[PDB]
Design an enzyme around this catalytic site. Structure first.
Site, PDB file in Angstrom:
ATOM      1  N   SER A 196       0.840  -1.193   0.000  1.00  0.00           N
ATOM      2  CA  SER A 196       0.000   0.000   0.000  1.00  0.00           C
ATOM      3  C   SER A 196       0.881   1.251   0.000  1.00  0.00           C
ATOM      4  CB  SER A 196      -0.915  -0.009   1.194  1.00  0.00           C
ATOM      5  OG  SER A 196      -0.157   0.096   2.400  1.00  0.00           O
ATOM      6  N   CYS A 198      -0.554   7.578  -3.194  1.00  0.00           N
ATOM      7  CA  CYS A 198      -1.876   8.208  -3.223  1.00  0.00           C
ATOM      8  C   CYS A 198      -1.903   9.290  -4.316  1.00  0.00           C
ATOM      9  CB  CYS A 198      -2.260   8.849  -1.880  1.00  0.00           C
ATOM     10  SG  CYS A 198      -0.964   9.889  -1.126  1.00  0.00           S
ATOM     11  N   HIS A 241       0.041  19.079  -0.450  1.00  0.00           N
ATOM     12  CA  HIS A 241      -0.177  17.840   0.239  1.00  0.00           C
ATOM     13  C   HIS A 241      -0.555  18.115   1.692  1.00  0.00           C
ATOM     14  CE1 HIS A 241       0.305  13.559   0.728  1.00  0.00           C
ATOM     15  NE2 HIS A 241       0.627  13.506  -0.575  1.00  0.00           N
TER      16      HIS A 241
HETATM   17  N1  LIG Z   1      -2.471   9.272   3.219  1.00  0.00           N
HETATM   18  C1  LIG Z   1      -1.327   8.591   3.339  1.00  0.00           C
HETATM   19  O1  LIG Z   1      -0.601   8.687   4.336  1.00  0.00           O
HETATM   20  C2  LIG Z   1      -0.889   7.667   2.234  1.00  0.00           C
HETATM   21  C3  LIG Z   1      -1.434   7.629   0.964  1.00  0.00           C
HETATM   22  C4  LIG Z   1      -0.925   6.722   0.036  1.00  0.00           C
HETATM   23  C5  LIG Z   1       0.111   5.871   0.371  1.00  0.00           C
HETATM   24  N2  LIG Z   1       0.621   5.920   1.610  1.00  0.00           N
HETATM   25  C6  LIG Z   1       1.697   4.999   2.038  1.00  0.00           C
HETATM   26  O2  LIG Z   1       1.219   4.017   3.007  1.00  0.00           O
HETATM   27  C7  LIG Z   1       2.161   3.728   4.055  1.00  0.00           C
HETATM   28  C8  LIG Z   1       1.479   3.571   5.457  1.00  0.00           C
HETATM   29  O3  LIG Z   1       1.510   4.659   6.431  1.00  0.00           O
HETATM   30  P1  LIG Z   1       0.290   5.083   7.471  1.00  0.00           P
HETATM   31  O4  LIG Z   1      -0.431   6.220   6.757  1.00  0.00           O
HETATM   32  O5  LIG Z   1      -0.498   3.828   7.822  1.00  0.00           O
HETATM   33  O6  LIG Z   1       0.966   5.749   8.824  1.00  0.00           O
HETATM   34  P2  LIG Z   1       1.036   5.135  10.341  1.00  0.00           P
HETATM   35  O7  LIG Z   1       2.198   5.622  11.158  1.00  0.00           O
HETATM   36  O8  LIG Z   1      -0.284   5.374  11.039  1.00  0.00           O
HETATM   37  O9  LIG Z   1       1.312   3.578   9.930  1.00  0.00           O
HETATM   38  C9  LIG Z   1       2.298   2.698  10.484  1.00  0.00           C
HETATM   39  C10 LIG Z   1       1.600   1.591  11.273  1.00  0.00           C
HETATM   40  O10 LIG Z   1       2.239   0.329  11.094  1.00  0.00           O
HETATM   41  C11 LIG Z   1       2.726  -0.154  12.347  1.00  0.00           C
HETATM   42  N3  LIG Z   1       3.998  -0.884  12.123  1.00  0.00           N
HETATM   43  C12 LIG Z   1       5.223  -0.330  12.025  1.00  0.00           C
HETATM   44  N4  LIG Z   1       6.179  -1.281  11.795  1.00  0.00           N
HETATM   45  C13 LIG Z   1       5.568  -2.483  11.741  1.00  0.00           C
HETATM   46  C14 LIG Z   1       5.995  -3.900  11.524  1.00  0.00           C
HETATM   47  N5  LIG Z   1       7.298  -4.187  11.332  1.00  0.00           N
HETATM   48  N6  LIG Z   1       5.058  -4.883  11.518  1.00  0.00           N
HETATM   49  C15 LIG Z   1       3.753  -4.574  11.706  1.00  0.00           C
HETATM   50  N7  LIG Z   1       3.293  -3.310  11.920  1.00  0.00           N
HETATM   51  C16 LIG Z   1       4.126  -2.221  11.951  1.00  0.00           C
HETATM   52  C17 LIG Z   1       2.802   1.076  13.256  1.00  0.00           C
HETATM   53  O11 LIG Z   1       2.601   0.838  14.652  1.00  0.00           O
HETATM   54  C18 LIG Z   1       1.646   1.898  12.763  1.00  0.00           C
HETATM   55  O12 LIG Z   1       0.444   1.489  13.427  1.00  0.00           O
HETATM   56  C19 LIG Z   1       3.257   4.787   3.853  1.00  0.00           C
HETATM   57  O13 LIG Z   1       4.469   4.150   3.456  1.00  0.00           O
HETATM   58  C20 LIG Z   1       2.862   5.710   2.704  1.00  0.00           C
HETATM   59  O14 LIG Z   1       3.898   5.876   1.732  1.00  0.00           O
HETATM   60  C21 LIG Z   1       0.134   6.784   2.521  1.00  0.00           C
END
Ligand SMILES: NC(=O)c1ccc[n+]([C@@H]2O[C@H](COP(=O)([O-])OP(=O)(O)OC[C@H]3O[C@@H](n4cnc5c(N)ncnc54)[C@H](O)[C@@H]3O)[C@@H](O)[C@H]2O)c1
Ligand SMILES: NC(=O)c1ccc[n+]([C@@H]2O[C@H](COP(=O)([O-])OP(=O)(O)OC[C@H]3O[C@@H](n4cnc5c(N)ncnc54)[C@H](O)[C@@H]3O)[C@@H](O)[C@H]2O)c1
Lengths: 333, 333
Positions: free
Chosen positions: A120, A150, A177
């Site tokens: 993702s 995204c 952004h």
């Molecule tokens: N709106 C956006 O933020 C958006 C849009 C498109 C794509 N993305 C991509 O999606 C990704 C996800 O980020 P997010 O928005 O969920 O932020 P976030 O900090 O809320 O997500 C990280 C989550 O994963 C957990 N985690 C960390 N390491 C782990 C491991 N080794 N095993 C299992 N769980 C673990 C953390 O505790 C946390 O709950 C990013 O890399 C980003 O590039 C984000």
């Protein structure tokens, strides 16, 4: 139909999970987060500061997360290879921690007994798909794939429509952004990019974005004909793309409106939106489109050089595209 | 005169360092941060989003940080016992990472060859001092001490003046608190307190605060007669304290103004401010007072029950009190 596991219950984990139940297109059966206990998962899922309380029921019951009576196995594994996905019945795994974004690192999930993995987030090597653009190019040989940025999901649908109808010679993309979780409120420490370490409340922060280069991968005709950058600004949600681009075939701005509206009603329905209303960012909160073309806000200098504006809900649109993609992968099984 | 080392180059590390050069009351000779390279230290120190660019010169020169020609030894040690403070000539060490806030954990610095340690944060067991209130109670027997919460530094001076003149029977404190670095922009994960994990841009977030209990330690007469809570709000800097309290001796609100103004001009000069101007938070940006009494904003119901308002720059005031304290410790050497 397809049973799905989610690695990481972050913004993306949680909102992908929301979209799964909201649409009922897949079934979440397993969730792994080592940094969140089960009771806290209930809290974090139920209440969203931005999208509001969950339209449904969620409770913890005998070590399982129960969303609308559908029970969900919880794992607490730092190391992805040690998640017993197979045991819990998780066919596909959504890799949504964004620290396992390589073919190599994401592959760990296969050891647990996952059949396929969907990153993702952009991947350095795993193939990227954007619904409505190049998702037809998925086949069953691909065990590990990416659903792109995204931003890439917003830009590619618009770019496709424009390139198909008038041809993009060359383009330059700015994204304004909303704030991500890789940014800071004040503090300081941010290893690699120094600007991202600055306070996000206080300022407009430039940032890099391979989203333009990446459109070149999903629409291969446009390879090396786009690039861009980003400004992070302190709005809670909803971002906007500004594509400045040269067309080869002349296009009155009214012609561009026509072909974009056409696509929004037809082949890109539910992915590319169109609006002429005098909208602002927060009008797109919880909008499920990948990209919504603002007809009013865009400007054209001449028939070969135009600036096109497109809104996207960075969280909700992408979350829904992840689910839509898996659904499609499952149809091709 | 006294040579000082700083463990952790966070908001506090950096601003304590600023205050040291700005006042020239102590000399920074050593800095340890394992998570920041030297080149990035230059960037983070030079530019402050909130307090503006550093009034002076800062450059990296042969692995040393050089601030106004004064060169500074850099360490990169995760483990505090392995910092060679003694070698670099660091007499006193400012413990400003806020993860070594116990007598036990902070003590590690003594192994490196520090003579004394000042915890820039409340401590569970180490003795707490608030300049202008109980700093006279420091003696040379104390090897490890705390300079209390920024909030405690705001509340205690005001509380002292009121209790000295009219006596606090009982009081209840609310602090409206600008954002800290223990808060999040959106994301989710925050182990222990769930509210602090919510998005800081979007909302008003309740939070706990031992600052009221802690005033009971520094002013021992007031022990158990105060408690309170906090709301975190999305302003970049400057917080405010709202002390609701019962007085034993009657006090017209004009009497309270008089005794507070008196203290601000006399025994608490430069620590407790007084203003009648129609001010707002951002009017206190980079104010070095621990606490500034807003005469206008406060309200009284009767002569025994009043609400007193006091502004504090959470970063700058406290940073300056850390330096002021060390200076005083060095005088008593
Ligand atoms: N709106 C956006 O933020 C958006 C849009 C498109 C794509 N993305 C991509 O999606 C990704 C996800 O980020 P997010 O928005 O969920 O932020 P976030 O900090 O809320 O997500 C990280 C989550 O994963 C957990 N985690 C960390 N390491 C782990 C491991 N080794 N095993 C299992 N769980 C673990 C953390 O505790 C946390 O709950 C990013 O890399 C980003 O590039 C984000
Ligand atoms: N305005 C305020 O934030 C304020 C006011 C009064 C008191 N305090 C207290 O001061 C403390 C400091 O926080 P901050 O404001 O500097 O935030 P911060 O995140 O900017 O500070 C942490 C810094 O220390 C570094 N660090 C972390 N672990 C380390 C280790 N083991 N060894 C060396 N360096 C390490 C980090 O990289 C970072 O640079 C907090 O505990 C807080 O209670 C803060």
């Amino acid at each position: 139909k397809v049973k799905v596991g989610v690695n990481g219950f972050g913004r993306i984990g949680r909102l992908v999970t929301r979209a799964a139940f909201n649409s009922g297109k897949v079934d979440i059966v397993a969730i792994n987060d080592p940094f969140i206990d089960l009771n806290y998962m209930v809290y974090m899922f139920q209440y969203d500061s931005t999208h509001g309380k969950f339209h449904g029921t969620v409770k913890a019951e005998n070590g399982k997360l129960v969303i609308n009576g559908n029970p969900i196995t919880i794992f607490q594994e730092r190391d992805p290879s040690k998640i017993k996905w197979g045991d819990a019945g998780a066919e596909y795994v959504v890799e949504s921690t964004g620290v396992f974004t390589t073919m190599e690192k994401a592959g760990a999930h296969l050891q647990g007994g996952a059949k396929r993995v969907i990153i993702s987030a952009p991947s350095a090597d795993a193939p990227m798909f954007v619904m409505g653009v190049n998702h037809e190019k998925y086949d069953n040989s691909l065990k590990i794939i990416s659903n792109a940025s995204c931003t890439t999901n917003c830009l590619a649908p618009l770019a496709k429509v424009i390139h198909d109808n008038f041809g993009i010679v060359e383009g330059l993309m700015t994204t304004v952004h909303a704030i991500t979780a890789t940014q800071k409120t004040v503090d300081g420490p941010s290893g690699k990019l120094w600007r991202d370490g600055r306070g996000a409340l206080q300022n407009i922060i430039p940032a890099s974005t391979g989203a333009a280069k990446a459109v070149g991968k999903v629409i291969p005709e446009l390879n090396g004909k786009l690039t861009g950058m980003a400004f992070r600004v302190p709005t809670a949600n909803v971002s906007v793309v500004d594509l400045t681009c040269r067309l080869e075939k002349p296009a009155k701005y009214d012609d561009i409106k026509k072909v974009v509206k056409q696509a929004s009603e037809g082949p890109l329905l539910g992915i590319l939106g169109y609006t002429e209303h005098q909208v602002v960012s927060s009008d797109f909160n919880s909008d499920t489109h990948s990209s919504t073309f603002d007809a009013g806000a865009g400007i054209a200098l001449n028939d070969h050089f135009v600036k096109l504006i497109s809104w996207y809900d960075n969280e909700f649109g992408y979350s829904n595209r992840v689910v839509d993609l898996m659904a499609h992968m499952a149809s091709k099984e």
